[PDB]
Every structure is written in C-alpha cells, then in structure tokens.
From a paper:
Modulation of voltage-gated potassium (Kv) channels by auxiliary subunits is central to the physiological function of channels in the brain and heart. Here we report cryo-electron microscopy structures of the Kv4.2–DPP6S–KChIP1 dodecamer complex, the Kv4.2–KChIP1 and Kv4.2–DPP6S octamer complexes, and Kv4.2 alone. Thus, our data suggest that two distinct modes of modulation contribute in an additive manner to evoke A-type currents from the native Kv4 macromolecular complex.
However, the focused refinement improved the resolutions of the transmembrane and intracellular regions to 3.4 Å and 3.9 Å for the Kv4.2–DPP6S and Kv4.2–DPP6S–KChIP1 complexes, respectively. The structures revealed that one DPP6S binds to one Kv4.2 in both complexes through their transmembrane domains, forming an octamer for Kv4.2–DPP6S and a dodecamer for Kv4.2–DPP6S–KChIP1. In the structures of the Kv4.2–DPP6S and Kv4.2–DPP6S–KChIP1 complexes, the DPP6S transmembrane helix hydrophobically interacts with the voltage-sensing domain of Kv4.2, specifically at the lower half of S1 and the upper half of S2. Structural comparisons of Kv4.2–DPP6S and Kv4.2–DPP6S–KChIP1 as well as that of Kv4.2 alone and Kv4.2–KChIP1 further support the role of KChIP1 as a modulator of the Kv4.2 S6 helix by stabilizing the conformations of the Kv4.2 N and C termini as well as the intracellular S6 helix. KChIP1 and DPP6S do not directly interact with each other in the Kv4.2–KChIP1–DPP6S ternary complex. The structure of the Kv4.2–DPP6S–KChIP1 dodecameric complex supports the additive contribution of KChIPs and DPPs to the modulation of Kv4s in the ternary complex.
Numbering used by the authors:
A (entry chain K): 28 to 58
B (entry chain C): 2 to 157, 167 to 219, 224 to 450, 472 to 495
C (entry chain B): 2 to 150
D (entry chain B): 398 to 450, 472 to 495
E (entry chain A): 2 to 51
F (entry chain D): 398 to 446
G (entry chain F): 37 to 186, 191 to 216
H (entry chain G): 36 to 186, 191 to 216
The structure:
Amino acid sequence: AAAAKGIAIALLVILVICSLIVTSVILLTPA
Amino acid sequence: AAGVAAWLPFARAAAIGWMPVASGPMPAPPRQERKRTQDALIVLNVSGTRFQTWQDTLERYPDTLLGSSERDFFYHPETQQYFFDRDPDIFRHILNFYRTGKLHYPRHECISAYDEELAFFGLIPEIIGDCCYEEYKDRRRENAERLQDDADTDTAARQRVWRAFENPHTSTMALVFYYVTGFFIAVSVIANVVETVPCGSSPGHIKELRYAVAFFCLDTACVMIFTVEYLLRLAAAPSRYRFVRSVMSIIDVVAILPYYIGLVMTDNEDVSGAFVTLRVFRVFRIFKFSRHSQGLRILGYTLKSCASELGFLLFSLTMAIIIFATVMFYAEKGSSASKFTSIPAAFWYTIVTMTTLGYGDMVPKTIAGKIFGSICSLSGVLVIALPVPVIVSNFSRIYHQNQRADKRRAQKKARLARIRAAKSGSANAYMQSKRSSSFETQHHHLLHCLEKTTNHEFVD
Amino acid sequence: AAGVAAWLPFARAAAIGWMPVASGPMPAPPRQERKRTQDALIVLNVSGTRFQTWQDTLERYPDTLLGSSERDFFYHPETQQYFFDRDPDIFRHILNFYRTGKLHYPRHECISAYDEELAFFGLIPEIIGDCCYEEYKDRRRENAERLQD
Amino acid sequence: IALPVPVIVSNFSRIYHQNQRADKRRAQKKARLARIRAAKSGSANAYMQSKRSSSFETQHHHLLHCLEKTTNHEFVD
Amino acid sequence: AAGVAAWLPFARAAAIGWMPVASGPMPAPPRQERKRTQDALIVLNVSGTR
Amino acid sequence: IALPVPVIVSNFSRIYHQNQRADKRRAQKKARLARIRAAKSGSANAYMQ
Amino acid sequence: EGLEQLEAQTNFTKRELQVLYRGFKNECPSGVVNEDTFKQIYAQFFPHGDASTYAHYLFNAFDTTQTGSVKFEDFVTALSILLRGTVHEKLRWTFNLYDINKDGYINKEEMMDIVKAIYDMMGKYTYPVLKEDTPRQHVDVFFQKMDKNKTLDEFLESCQEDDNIMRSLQLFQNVM
Amino acid sequence: PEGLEQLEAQTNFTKRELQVLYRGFKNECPSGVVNEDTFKQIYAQFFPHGDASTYAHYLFNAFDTTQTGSVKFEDFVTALSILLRGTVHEKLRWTFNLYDINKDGYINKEEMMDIVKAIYDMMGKYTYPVLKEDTPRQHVDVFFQKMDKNKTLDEFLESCQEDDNIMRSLQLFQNVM
C-alpha cells in the first residue's frame, strides 16, 4: 500500500526521466 | 478357474461324460484332507466389527492378502479370531469382492483412503467390475491432478536472479521492473494509434503552409527497450535456444523484429507496396500485455485446450457460407442492381448476415432471396452459438483451476510451517527432558545415545 | 515424531550402524517393561457398537482425548470398556485418523455435528488430509455464511 | 462480449437466491423465537399447576420454591 | 429446563448464593429415590443393532 | 430465438461426451479382453509347471 | 487428571466425578466453559425471568485468576467445596462471590446489584408486585443484621449466630 | 515369510513380537515392499534436528542386497533380527559391509569420511561445541587410529573386542527387546 506507493512514485520518477531523455533526444534534432 | 471352486462337483459329473471314450490308466484322485465343506465361518475382525465368512471363499483368490498365507501375521491365537486394524466400511467392499469376483466403489468415500486400503489387502486396483469403474477412475484422476498441482515445487548466482526478475511480486524490485515495461508498451501502442490522427502526424493542417515527426524517435527508444529486455531474457534463459520456442518468447521476438527489418529495408532496394505490411506489425506490441494481466494467459490456455472443436467451428462455418452463398448468387444473379455479382462477392453477404450483423450494403431483392436470407440468419445464430459454451465454460473452469492452485499453495505453505513448528516443539521437548508415556522417554534415550556417540550436546 | 512408535526398534537397530565410531558411556536402556509384547485389545464402545484397537496405536497422539490420561474419565469399570456417549459413526473416522495420522471427512455429514464430535475428542480441523480438506473447507464456508445470515 | 456475461448472470442469480433465502430464514428465525417463548410459557404454566397441586421437575420446582421463599413473593398465572 | 438435567448440582451451588438474604421456612428437599447417577446403560435394540 | 438454443447445445455437448466416453470404453474393453487372455495363459503355464 | 483426583481436590466419589464430568463435557466439548454458556444454562433453569447478571457474578466467583474462562479443575473444586465441604468453605465462597472487587469491606452498591440480580429473576407475574421499594428494605434489614460500625468477620459471626442460615445449607449437602 | 515359517528359525524373534512388527511394518508400507524414498522420511522424523536422509541412503542399499531397488519384509526382518537379538560376531559383519562402499571388502580411507560426516549431520546447528569443517575429518582420523596401521576386516573383527566400548555398546539392545 503506502510502502508500495512510495516505490510506485519512485518508479514514476524514473519513467519520467526516461521520457525526458527522449524529449532531449527529439530536441537534439529540431527543424 | 479358482473363482468358481464351489462348482467342482458339476465338472465331476461332466467327467462321467467321457468315460466310455477313454483309453488310459485313469490316474485316480490325488486324495484330500477332507472330502466335505465343514470349514466353519472364521471370525475376522476389523477395528471392532466382526465380518464372518467361510474359509473356502477366502482361499478362492490366493494372491490377495486374505488369501494365501500372509494372513497369519494378523491371526490372534489367544482369542482365535483374525484381527485387522483397517476401516470397517471400506473393508466391506473387499469382503464382497471374494463373494462375487468384482469390487465396487462407494459414491461417497475418500479415494485416497479407499485406494490405500485396496492396496493394503494386496489386490490390483483395476479389478473393478466396470460398474463403478467410470466413477472410480474419474475420482482417481481428479485426485492425481490435485496432487500434481500439489507438486508445483516452485523455487526462489544468476539462476535465482533471473527467477526473481520473473517473480511477479518482489515488492520494490519486480514491481518497478514490470511497471516500466507496462508503461513503455502502452505508450508505444498509443503512439502507433495517434500517429494517424490528422493534426498528430499526417497532412491535416500543413496544406496551407504541428506535423512533428518525433514518433520515429519514440519508436526507436521503445524498441531499444524491448531489445535490451529480450537480451536480458536471453541471458536469463536456463536453456538459451531450447526456451526460445516459447509462446511469450516468440511474441517478444516478433514484437521487435519489424523495426529491425524496416531499418534493413530502408537502406535496401525499395519495393512499392511493402512498407504497409511492416507498419501493420507495429500493433503487435500490444500482445506483450500477456505478462501484465493473467486473463490473456487464461484465454490462451482456453483456445489451446478446446482447440479441437474450433476446427469444427471453422469447417462448419465454411460449409454454411458456401451453401448459402451458392444459393444467394443464383437466387438473384439477375436483378436491377444485381449486387451479387459472383460467389466471392456473395461471401460477404452470407457472412454479414450469418453473424447477425446486418449492414444494408447488399440485401436480397427477389422473393427467393428473402426466404433463404432469413434461413441463413437463423442458421448463423445456431452455428455461431453452438461452440460458445464449450469455450466460455472451459475458460471459467480453467480460471477456477488457477485460483484453486493458489489457494492450495498457500495452504501447503501453512502446513509446512506447522510441520516445522512441530519439529521445533519436539526439539524443545527433548531439551526439557534433558534438563529435568514411554515412547517419549525412549526417544529421548536414543537421542542421548546419539549425544555420546558423537560427543556433542543440544542447546536451544 | 510420536506416531511412529512401531518403528522404534528399527531406529534402535540403526544405532548398530555407528557402534564402531561410538565413544561414550552408552547410558543403557532406562528400565523398560514387558520385553515381549502383551498388548491387549482395548474396546471403545460409542453408545452402541464397539471398536477394538491396540493401546500403543491409541496412545501415539497424546494431545487428544483418546490419548493422555484424560480417557480414564470415561473408563466404565464393571464392564472394562470405555463407554463414550458420542455418535457411533464419526468416531470411526477418528479411529481411522489414529491408525494413520491423516483424518478424513466424508461428504454426507452435517458440519455442526461432525465438528462438534471432532472438537469433543480434542481434535483440531487442520489435521484433515489434503484430499478431503478442500471439500471440508467449502462445507465449513457455506455453513459459516448460513450462521452469518 | 460473450466471455463475461455467463459470469455476470450467474452472480446475479446467486445474489437473488441469497436475498430470497435470507427472507425465508428471517421468517424461520421469527418462528423459532416464538417457539422459545412458548416453551418458557409452558414451563411457567407447569410450575403454576404444580403450585396448585418426572424426577427432574421435583428438584426444579424445589429450587423454584427456594427462590420463592428467599424473596417471600409467590408466583401467579 | 429438562434438557440440561445433568447440571442440577451447578444450580444447587447457585442456591447457596442467596442464603443470607433469605427469609422463610426453607421447605427442604422433596426427597428422592436415589441421590446418585448409577442408572446403568439400557441396551435398546433396533432390528439387531444394540 | 434464445428459447431452443440451450437445448440444442446441451444435446450436442451430451452427444460429444457419449462419443468420447465410448472410445475410452472401447479401449477399456480391449484391455479387459487382453487381461482375460493373459489369465488363461497363466493358468495354462501353471498346469505346465 | 481424573486418575489421582479422587478426593485430593474434591469431596466427590469417582462415579459421581466422572458422571459430572460427562455432563459438563456434553455442554462445553472444548472442556472450558465461558460466560455465555453460563447465561444459557442458568436462564434455561429459570424460564420465567432474566438472571444474566447473577450468572455473571457466579462465573466471576467461579473464574479464579480472572482468566476469562474456567477449566474443569477449578469448577469441580468449587462444586466440592460448595456441596460436600465444611461450612467455613461455604462462607469463604460467599465472601468471594459477594466481593465483586478485591476489597475487604462490603458497601451499599454490592447489595444493590445482588438484590437486583435476585429480583429480576421473577418478572412481572407475582402477587406482591415487587418494585424498587422492597430491595432496599431487604438491604437495610441485612444492614441492621450487619455491624453498626462502617466486616467479613462480622458477617461470618452473624452466620454462625443464626440457626436458620446454618440449617439452610445441609439440605443440599447430603443430596447429590 | 509365512509368519510361522520365519519364526525363531532363521529369525530369532518370538511370534508374538513378530506379528506386531509386521503389523507396524505394513501399516506404513501397505504394498509390503519399502522403497528407499519411503526409507528416508520414516527415519528423519525421529530426529527434529538436521536431516538424516544421507545416512538412510547408505542404510538402504546395505539393507537391499543384489540392488533390487526396494526391500521386502523377509530381508528387513532378517537384518532387524541379526541386529537387535543377533550374534555379537554376526552383528559387526553387516556393519563392515555397511562401512564398505567400494563393493569389495577393502578400506582406502575414503569410505569413512562420508559416513562420519553424515552421522555428524544429525545435530545441525544447535550443537554445544559448534561443528567446524575440520571436526568431521578429525573424527575420521580418530576412527583411523583404531583401524589397521599396517596395510582390514580381520583386524577390525579382532580389535572390536579389544575396545570394550563396542562390547558393551552392542549389548544395549541385545538383551532388551
């Protein structure tokens, strides 16, 4: 529950940072 | 045979039949202990109930326990009556076997106890006289599969690491490992969905002059994630090539091949009308959700369990389609619109109405069209709904099996914990005996002998 | 455990396996009685029919009522037979458990009565063999929801 | 679409059966409590008859008389 | 009630509870045939089973 | 239309069950006749001994 | 134990002991009786009023060590001292029963709730028509029989100073 | 194996005790032929300490001659007889066969390491002097002290009487039962 919720937020953060890496990659090639 | 030993005198008379046609010495009887049947009823007891029966009946069948000589151990000379420690009601059927020559099986008694009693008296299980066999073998198979599910023997360097990765719930680790993949496959498939909406990625608002082609970057990232996950799985396989052929593994490998093949095609010779097939396979990433929800696995087990009658569904559907189309086309080949141009053009009608779907793109016009169209609709209801329950009931049964397996796994673990607790209690009792109703004393004495023979002492 | 008394000599025999390696005072058997077996058929009649069984068989599970010294409350002296005032059928399954160690449970029995007779003799439900345990738990569940209503 | 409908309808039928059997059970419980009240009334009337004029009932009525005297209040119908 | 006639001695002890608060003649026991429970088991047979 | 379909499908399932159980029964009958032949062979060999 | 407990902890014969044990076991097969069984049995003996609180007091007297459920050992010990012991043991048991707490002295409210436990037994079908008036005349009369000074020893000596209470005990002693 | 054929003749037990032994034997192995798999848990449950399957495995093949894979009642009772109420000379011959694992009756110092470590495996972890990896080989060397320094069944059979520990340890169960 709450203990699982903490690691759920922790993994939400790593998913977000992976998506932000993807956004950095797409911004690397604009037009 | 020995099963009808009560009818020797019959054959004795039969012997007199072939006396005048005989030519020999007539080797005479081999004599006997007694030419009578005064052998009295022998009181054989089972846990306090006396089952009197005649000796000749017992030695009618020799190889069983009650036959031959192995009953002497159970003999009780100081009161002159056989004693057995077994179950009375169970033993009654074994008693009946000697009287008749074929056992039975009670509708309502535990198969484990009955089978162990049956084997105890040394008589083969399949003596059943095909009157209760249909039920005994049914219950025996049910118990056998119950204990097979009792034998799931699930376990816990990298040999345990990859299993823990496969473990659905390791709290902090496996939950992250699954959630990342679930989110990423979800965003991949939703990207494939949205890469088609006009404003998203297509010439929807650029004709005047956003069409942001970044879905290629997202697809590349996602498929990189898939391929690294599958490389981890390939290093995680106990048998590298042997476990590739698995269903989930082949779904994974076909969930990654289209991207690589597309890249190889891009720098290869371009073939017109071929990239559409490649883009179609982009949707198969959604199949990876099998590991997400067990319902997909239950459905796969259903479709590959009742895979016999699905062939019948397909074959009978083809029969009905052909039969009704070949009468539809000839029924109204000549008409105003004459939409039923040909039989392959009538397949669509006979399948849009066999399924009770109903569009109106093509409908019968002649009167002879109407009757057979309605007949087709009813036949479609029948054929379609015929193999439904064999699938949905099978699916529900398999789901109940998979719930029962978890329940019995939890119960088995609790029982094992109780066994460990009882063992610890035995050790505690021995220690208490050492510090300060005969079997416990003798057991403690034997452990004391172990203490001396191995010069080591026991402490809590 | 305590239910394998019949194999006690065998373990004794196993001791001979390590006599050459043994080095100790060998405390010697503790004044056991009746070297030759004089087991008598103890009879338990339960409001009617009688079940005959040994004493070592009946005493391998001392935590229950038929074990221990509790059963001596029910000894009926002038006839020399324990007269339990219980049901004459479920007791058969209880005796079967004493014989094996894995108690069973048939289907055609009321849960209230069966559980009452099972708790009277000091037994606990979890001992039921795994083969009958599922059906027992289902019946207990439906009777429990009945009493909940 | 046909996969979950048997489950849904089976659950609905089961719940309807639970409701109807609960109603019948409540009627049965009312009958049982009425029977218990009737049994107490019958025992009281039997004691009344004994006051006017089985082995167990002798000592039962004796204890009831003891309760009567320890409070010096007698019992009427 | 008569269904728990095995537990008269219990209530007998319970009687001793309200002795000092009593005021009356204490009408004494109605006597008995036997103040024991030696009534032996009675073999009642049903079609051959006792 | 939904009135007769449960009857039809129940009959079909029943008939399929009858076929499969008949096949299993025929296998059982073959096993039983083999056992009878084995029993006669055993009695003959006992007489030989 | 039942094999050595012949008279060491009881004043009961072996046959009486075992038949009483079977009677007890037929009601509480687990071997230990709780308070709900006490209400059930005690009310079933008196199917005319309500006496749950008196049975509560009886169990609390029975339940030594405040365990919450008395085993057979203490139950049979209490029965023996109540029915086939000496009068001093009965008076000690009356001390324990009337002493709802762990105090020494006895106050007004103890006789209040005991006399309520007695008076609620009847109901509303008695000729004198009991009310709240009678219980505290009864308790008052007890108090003038009790010491004027504001005693367990005094209550004792009052018990062995009156013949009626002394003879109110043997009539259950001999029988059963 | 008729219950009267295998009396004190070839099986030195009274028939009254032999009946009880058979009753308790078939009560655990109804088929009448015990397999080594059953031979493990019927034994390990005697010791609530560490497992004993290792010793039971070496017991079984000694019990089961000719590698039948399972023991019948006749051999079981024969061995139980020669142990519990057998001859002191004949008691130790089987045990020499037990200690021998290389089939032929020869000692090459390796058949005792496993046996002694299996015997020491019973106590587990709750021992007073905590076991160390050197302790089993030390006890094996203690046993090597009493075996033939010169380069045996004959010396062991002649020195077992020399060590009175064996002599009054074998008699613990010879008289009893």
